Short mmCIF file of C-alpha atoms and ligand atoms in Angstrom, two decimals:
data_model
loop_
_atom_site.label_atom_id
_atom_site.label_comp_id
_atom_site.label_asym_id
_atom_site.label_seq_id
_atom_site.Cartn_x
_atom_site.Cartn_y
_atom_site.Cartn_z
CA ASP A 926 126.77 92.90 101.50
CA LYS A 927 125.30 95.43 98.97
CA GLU A 928 124.44 97.96 101.66
CA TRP A 929 126.87 100.80 100.34
CA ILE A 930 126.37 100.28 96.60
CA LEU A 931 122.48 99.96 96.85
CA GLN A 932 122.33 103.11 99.01
CA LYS A 933 124.28 105.24 96.66
CA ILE A 934 122.26 103.97 93.32
CA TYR A 935 119.26 104.71 95.47
CA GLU A 936 120.67 108.29 96.03
CA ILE A 937 121.51 108.79 92.36
CA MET A 938 117.66 107.66 91.18
CA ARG A 939 116.72 110.29 93.73
CA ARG A 940 118.77 112.82 92.72
CA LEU A 941 118.29 112.19 88.70
CA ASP A 942 114.24 112.87 89.80
CA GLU A 943 115.03 116.19 91.53
CA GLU A 944 117.10 117.43 88.68
CA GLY A 945 114.08 116.28 85.95
CA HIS A 946 116.27 113.18 84.67
CA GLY A 947 112.95 111.51 85.10
CA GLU A 948 114.03 108.87 82.31
CA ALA A 949 117.17 108.37 83.59
CA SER A 950 115.68 107.93 86.88
CA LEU A 951 113.59 105.21 85.76
CA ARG A 952 116.49 103.44 84.35
CA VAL A 953 118.22 103.18 87.71
CA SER A 954 114.72 102.29 89.35
CA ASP A 955 114.99 99.30 86.75
CA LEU A 956 118.50 98.46 88.27
CA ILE A 957 117.52 98.59 91.80
CA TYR A 958 114.85 95.78 91.05
CA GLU A 959 117.36 93.53 89.39
CA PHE A 960 119.83 93.87 91.65
CA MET A 961 117.86 93.35 94.64
CA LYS A 962 116.26 89.94 92.93
CA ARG A 963 119.92 88.48 93.56
CA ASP A 964 121.07 86.44 96.46
CA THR B 1057 68.34 96.55 78.55
CA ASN B 1058 71.22 98.88 80.11
CA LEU B 1059 74.49 99.08 77.97
CA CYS B 1060 77.68 98.45 79.89
CA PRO B 1061 79.15 101.62 81.14
CA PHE B 1062 82.78 100.85 79.86
CA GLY B 1063 82.87 105.00 79.10
CA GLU B 1064 83.32 105.44 83.02
CA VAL B 1065 86.23 103.19 82.76
CA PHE B 1066 87.97 103.92 79.47
CA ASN B 1067 87.27 107.53 79.34
CA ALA B 1068 88.01 108.70 83.11
CA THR B 1069 89.85 111.77 83.46
CA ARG B 1070 92.10 110.66 85.81
CA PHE B 1071 93.61 107.02 85.92
CA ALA B 1072 94.53 105.10 89.19
CA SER B 1073 98.38 104.60 90.18
CA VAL B 1074 99.29 100.86 89.56
CA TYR B 1075 100.13 100.31 92.98
CA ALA B 1076 96.86 101.30 94.13
CA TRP B 1077 95.14 99.95 90.99
CA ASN B 1078 91.11 100.64 90.54
CA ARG B 1079 88.39 97.93 89.91
CA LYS B 1080 85.04 98.44 88.88
CA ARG B 1081 82.55 95.78 88.91
CA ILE B 1082 80.33 95.81 85.78
CA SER B 1083 76.95 94.08 86.22
CA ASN B 1084 73.41 93.97 84.91
CA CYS B 1085 73.85 95.41 81.38
CA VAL B 1086 74.43 94.48 77.67
CA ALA B 1087 77.97 94.94 76.47
CA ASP B 1088 79.00 95.09 72.73
CA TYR B 1089 83.01 94.02 72.86
CA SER B 1090 83.47 94.34 69.33
CA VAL B 1091 82.20 98.21 69.72
CA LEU B 1092 84.52 98.62 72.45
CA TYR B 1093 87.49 97.08 70.21
CA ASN B 1094 86.87 99.58 67.58
CA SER B 1095 86.29 102.59 69.82
CA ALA B 1096 89.88 104.13 70.07
CA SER B 1097 93.46 103.49 68.69
CA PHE B 1098 94.81 100.95 71.04
CA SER B 1099 98.46 99.66 71.34
CA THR B 1100 97.49 96.45 73.00
CA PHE B 1101 94.13 94.75 72.77
CA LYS B 1102 95.06 91.13 73.76
CA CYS B 1103 92.14 88.53 74.88
CA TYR B 1104 93.59 85.39 76.33
CA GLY B 1105 90.17 83.50 76.17
CA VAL B 1106 88.20 84.42 72.96
CA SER B 1107 88.39 87.13 70.80
CA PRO B 1108 85.88 90.30 71.20
CA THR B 1109 83.37 89.00 68.17
CA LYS B 1110 83.50 85.62 70.13
CA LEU B 1111 82.80 87.57 73.62
CA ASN B 1112 79.66 88.96 72.08
CA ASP B 1113 78.10 85.58 72.14
CA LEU B 1114 78.58 85.16 75.63
CA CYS B 1115 77.25 86.01 79.05
CA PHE B 1116 78.95 86.47 82.26
CA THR B 1117 78.01 86.73 86.09
CA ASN B 1118 80.14 89.72 86.42
CA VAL B 1119 82.81 91.68 84.30
CA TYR B 1120 85.60 93.24 86.48
CA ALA B 1121 87.70 96.15 84.85
CA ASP B 1122 90.84 96.97 86.58
CA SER B 1123 92.72 100.39 85.45
CA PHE B 1124 95.76 102.00 86.16
CA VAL B 1125 98.90 103.76 84.28
CA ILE B 1126 102.18 102.17 83.95
CA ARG B 1127 105.14 102.63 81.57
CA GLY B 1128 104.67 101.54 77.71
CA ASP B 1129 107.72 99.33 78.32
CA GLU B 1130 105.83 97.65 81.31
CA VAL B 1131 102.65 97.07 79.62
CA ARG B 1132 104.39 93.60 78.54
CA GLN B 1133 104.12 92.38 82.17
CA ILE B 1134 100.42 92.65 82.46
CA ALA B 1135 100.14 89.21 80.84
CA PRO B 1136 100.25 85.53 82.60
CA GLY B 1137 103.45 84.27 83.51
CA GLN B 1138 105.21 87.38 83.44
CA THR B 1139 107.87 88.98 86.14
CA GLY B 1140 109.09 92.06 86.81
CA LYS B 1141 108.73 95.41 88.54
CA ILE B 1142 105.04 95.57 87.95
CA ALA B 1143 104.02 92.04 87.91
CA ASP B 1144 105.98 91.29 91.03
CA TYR B 1145 105.02 94.31 93.23
CA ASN B 1146 102.30 96.08 91.79
CA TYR B 1147 99.61 94.09 89.87
CA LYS B 1148 99.68 90.54 88.79
CA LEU B 1149 97.88 88.41 86.93
CA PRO B 1150 97.14 84.52 87.27
CA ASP B 1151 98.92 81.90 85.04
CA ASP B 1152 95.17 80.73 83.95
CA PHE B 1153 94.02 84.14 83.03
CA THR B 1154 91.61 84.19 80.38
CA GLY B 1155 90.36 87.99 80.06
CA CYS B 1156 91.56 90.92 77.98
CA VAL B 1157 94.31 93.56 78.34
CA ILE B 1158 93.93 96.84 76.68
CA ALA B 1159 96.24 99.53 76.86
CA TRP B 1160 97.10 103.11 74.68
CA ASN B 1161 99.34 105.78 75.12
CA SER B 1162 98.44 108.34 77.21
CA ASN B 1163 101.55 110.66 77.18
CA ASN B 1164 98.89 113.79 76.14
CA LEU B 1165 97.18 113.43 79.51
CA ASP B 1166 99.29 111.94 82.03
CA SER B 1167 102.69 113.61 81.30
CA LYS B 1168 103.89 117.07 82.36
CA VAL B 1169 106.98 119.54 81.49
CA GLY B 1170 109.04 119.33 84.45
CA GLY B 1171 107.27 115.87 85.84
CA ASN B 1172 104.21 114.53 86.55
CA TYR B 1173 104.20 113.24 90.13
CA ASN B 1174 100.83 112.15 90.42
CA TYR B 1175 101.47 108.21 89.21
CA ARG B 1176 103.31 105.93 91.38
CA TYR B 1177 104.86 102.34 91.55
CA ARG B 1178 106.03 100.21 94.24
CA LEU B 1179 109.85 99.52 93.81
CA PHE B 1180 110.23 97.23 97.09
CA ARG B 1181 108.60 94.43 98.61
CA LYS B 1182 109.40 91.53 100.75
CA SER B 1183 107.71 88.91 98.65
CA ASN B 1184 105.88 88.93 95.06
CA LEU B 1185 102.12 89.50 95.05
CA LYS B 1186 99.55 86.73 94.49
CA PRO B 1187 97.17 87.24 91.76
CA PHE B 1188 95.20 90.11 91.89
CA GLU B 1189 96.37 91.21 95.31
CA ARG B 1190 96.50 94.95 95.77
CA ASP B 1191 99.04 96.32 98.36
CA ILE B 1192 98.74 100.13 99.38
CA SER B 1193 100.75 100.03 102.14
CA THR B 1194 103.52 102.47 103.06
CA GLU B 1195 105.79 101.16 105.57
CA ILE B 1196 109.47 101.96 105.14
CA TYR B 1197 111.13 98.96 103.61
CA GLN B 1198 114.13 97.38 105.25
CA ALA B 1199 116.82 96.60 102.22
CA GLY B 1200 119.67 96.32 104.94
CA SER B 1201 120.93 94.30 108.02
CA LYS B 1202 119.07 96.78 110.48
CA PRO B 1203 115.68 97.88 111.25
CA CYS B 1204 114.20 101.04 109.94
CA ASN B 1205 111.50 101.74 112.91
CA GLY B 1206 109.45 103.43 110.56
CA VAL B 1207 112.15 105.89 109.64
CA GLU B 1208 113.79 106.75 106.20
CA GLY B 1209 117.48 105.98 106.00
CA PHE B 1210 120.46 104.04 105.24
CA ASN B 1211 118.86 101.25 103.15
CA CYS B 1212 115.39 101.91 104.79
CA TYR B 1213 113.37 103.22 101.75
CA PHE B 1214 110.08 104.75 101.08
CA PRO B 1215 108.48 101.89 99.06
CA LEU B 1216 106.76 104.06 96.14
CA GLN B 1217 108.30 105.90 93.46
CA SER B 1218 107.02 108.30 91.30
CA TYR B 1219 107.08 107.87 87.64
CA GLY B 1220 107.70 111.48 86.94
CA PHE B 1221 106.42 111.33 83.22
CA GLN B 1222 107.79 114.20 80.89
CA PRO B 1223 106.41 114.29 77.36
CA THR B 1224 109.80 114.35 75.97
CA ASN B 1225 110.27 110.62 77.21
CA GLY B 1226 111.04 108.13 74.71
CA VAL B 1227 107.94 106.26 74.08
CA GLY B 1228 109.01 103.06 76.20
CA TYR B 1229 108.87 105.31 79.20
CA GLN B 1230 105.88 107.27 78.13
CA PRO B 1231 102.92 106.65 80.30
CA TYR B 1232 100.00 104.06 79.38
CA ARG B 1233 96.66 103.73 80.48
CA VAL B 1234 95.94 100.01 80.76
CA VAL B 1235 92.33 98.31 81.46
CA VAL B 1236 92.47 94.64 82.35
CA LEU B 1237 88.98 92.84 81.66
CA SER B 1238 88.05 89.73 83.84
CA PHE B 1239 85.16 87.73 82.72
CA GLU B 1240 83.49 85.95 85.78
CA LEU B 1241 81.72 82.83 85.44
CA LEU B 1242 80.16 81.75 88.81
CA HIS B 1243 77.34 79.30 89.11
CA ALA B 1244 74.69 81.75 88.77
CA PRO B 1245 72.38 83.54 86.34
CA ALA B 1246 74.37 85.80 83.89
CA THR B 1247 74.06 89.61 84.56
CA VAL B 1248 76.52 90.71 81.59
CA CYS B 1249 75.75 89.62 78.27
CA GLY B 1250 77.32 90.02 74.88
CA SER B 1251 75.36 92.00 72.19
CA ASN B 1252 75.00 88.88 69.92
CA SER B 1253 74.15 86.51 72.82
CA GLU B 1254 71.54 83.82 72.65
C1 LIG C 216 85.09 107.61 75.15
O1 LIG C 216 84.93 108.57 74.45
C2 LIG C 216 84.50 108.71 73.09
C3 LIG C 216 84.42 110.29 72.77
O2 LIG C 216 83.09 110.83 73.05
C4 LIG C 216 83.56 107.87 72.60
O3 LIG C 216 83.58 107.71 71.28
C5 LIG C 216 82.44 108.25 70.61
O4 LIG C 216 81.48 107.13 70.54
C6 LIG C 216 80.18 107.43 69.88
C7 LIG C 216 79.11 106.12 70.08
O5 LIG C 216 80.13 104.91 69.69
C8 LIG C 216 80.20 107.92 68.63
O6 LIG C 216 78.90 108.18 68.09
C9 LIG C 216 81.16 108.99 68.27
O7 LIG C 216 81.47 109.38 66.98
C10 LIG C 216 82.47 108.77 69.13
N1 LIG C 216 83.47 109.75 69.19
C11 LIG C 216 84.97 109.76 68.87
C12 LIG C 216 85.63 110.80 68.90
O8 LIG C 216 85.16 108.67 68.31
C13 LIG C 216 83.85 106.25 73.01
O9 LIG C 216 82.98 105.56 72.80
C14 LIG C 216 84.10 106.15 74.61
N2 LIG C 216 84.53 105.34 74.85
C15 LIG C 216 83.86 103.97 75.34
C16 LIG C 216 84.32 102.94 75.87
O10 LIG C 216 82.67 104.42 75.81
#
């Protein structure tokens, strides 16, 4: 399953935002989207 | 007699978030689409039926103007047949769309030093939106094996994310205001006519 790695990527996205890495957070968001489309 | 109030849409001070996109019904007025086309510097102005000039000879029952803010690199998803985070979970055009999609860079209004958090998008959804469907729900999203019970936690996510627009972003990650014009033709007397109709 992808549960642990999905959580870690989610957590980096949220941390990158809080630290003002607003554009890096959006790059991680895109990955979350593509990752979750896969079986 | 009345000129269509496109200004209320295109020149609004604040735009909607894409997940909760705004729709304005335009009716009972005269529309000059060539003047609209020339009214500002647009980064996108793509019509899928006929051109602005040709629109000016046409009458419609109503015109719908949908508006919202997305990233510059997401404007390509506001088009028939596209998939992606925005097309799938936020705003979906039908395969047979024949209206216009208009967009312009709004970094000067919709970005903030330290991040603008006013604009959000949906990152998680169990299924893709149907064309012109609008989902404003905020249920915690179950990404894993266990139910969330309305509580954020492990693999249990709030479904919306902030864009966090900052003016220093690269242009693909800068905010863009988008207006989608839909041209409705019912079996009905027209109420929105182009400037050179008849
Ligand atoms: C949005 O606002 C701008 C600014 O007022 C409008 O542009 C003006 O339009 C009038 C009439 O066409 C002109 O006389 C002015 O010279 C224009 N000003 C500028 C700075 O271009 C614009 O028309 C509005 N957009 C819409 C769709 O109504």
